[PDB]
Structures are given as structure tokens and as C-alpha cells.
Design a protein around this ligand. Structure first.
Ligand SMILES: *[C@@]12=NC3=[C]C([C])=C([C])[C]=C3N([C][C]([O])[C]([O])[C]([O])[C]OP([O])([O])=O)C1=NC(=O)[N]C2=O
Length: 108
């Protein structure tokens, strides 16, 4: 039902976020001044499973949509489960331009 959504700029090497819904900011606890121009890998931490992470990277590198479940931590430290889904956006000539991801706090 509910879920946040963001846009990452693939034209840039590190895939920084260039847009985030109001839910993303509220959920994560960070403000646009702290997220724009960055990679949401900053929401990851100790419990975060590096193997799951390793899957998004590859999907991205390979430029394929992908969904995985990762443990993320809000700005206050409180952790939460993130059911993330990443989708690539290719130009008419096949090249990838942006990446779109939909986050969902499935902490149940
Ligand atoms: C972040 N959501 C998110 C949304 C998009 C559109 C993309 C492309 C990536 C993410 N990430 C994954 C992260 O940026 C990175 O791709 C992986 O960490 C693998 O690369 P590294 O170089 O860091 O090993 C998001 N990850 C999250 O944990 N939370 C989000 O909301």
C-alpha cells in the first residue's frame, strides 16, 4: 500500500539520489540536505547483510531491476527492515540513465 520512493542518478558514478518522496525522509529520519547527492548505502549498517547488498550492486552494474530485503537504520540509530525494489531506466539507445527504487518498511 504505502511506501517511499527515490531516484538515483546513474549518469554519476556513485548512483546518488536526486529525488525522494516525503515518505523517505520521514521514514529514514534524514532530510533532503542529508540525502540528496548521495547513495542510500548510508542507511545500511551492522545488521545489514553484505551479501544482500552485493546483490543490488551487481543488479545495478548489470543494469537489471531487482528486489532484496535489507536491514536499515534511521538517523537516530533505530533499525528497520527495508523491502527495497530497484528499477533501471534506459535511454532509447539502451544506455542506463537513472535508477528508481521503491522502499517499504516491512518491519511488520
Ligand atoms: C537505497 N535504495 C536504492 C535505490 C536505488 C534506485 C538504487 C540504484 C540503489 C539503492 N540502494 C542500494 C545502494 O545504493 C548500493 O547500490 C548498494 O549498497 C550496493 O552498492 P555498494 O557500492 O554500496 O556495495 C539503497 N540501499 C539501501 O540500503 N536503502 C535505500 O533506500
Amino acid at each position: 500500500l504505502r511506501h517511499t520512493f527515490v531516484v538515483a542518478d546513474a549518469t554519476l558514478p556513485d548512483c546518488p539520489l536526486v529525488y525522494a518522496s516525503e515518505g523517505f525522509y520521514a521514514m529514514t529520519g534524514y532530510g533532503p540536505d542529508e540525502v540528496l547527492g548521495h547513495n542510500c548505502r548510508f542507511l545500511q549498517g551492522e545488521g545489514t547483510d553484505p551479501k544482500e547488498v552485493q546483490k543490488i550492486r551487481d543488479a545495478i552494474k548489470k543494469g537489471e531491476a531487482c528486489s532484496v530485503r535489507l536491514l536499515n537504520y534511521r538517523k537516530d540509530g533505530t533499525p528497520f527492515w527495508n523491502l527495497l525494489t530497484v528499477t533501471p531506466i534506459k535511454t532509447p539507445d539502451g544506455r542506463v540513465s537513472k535508477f528508481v527504487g521503491v522502499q517499504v518498511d516491512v518491519t511488520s
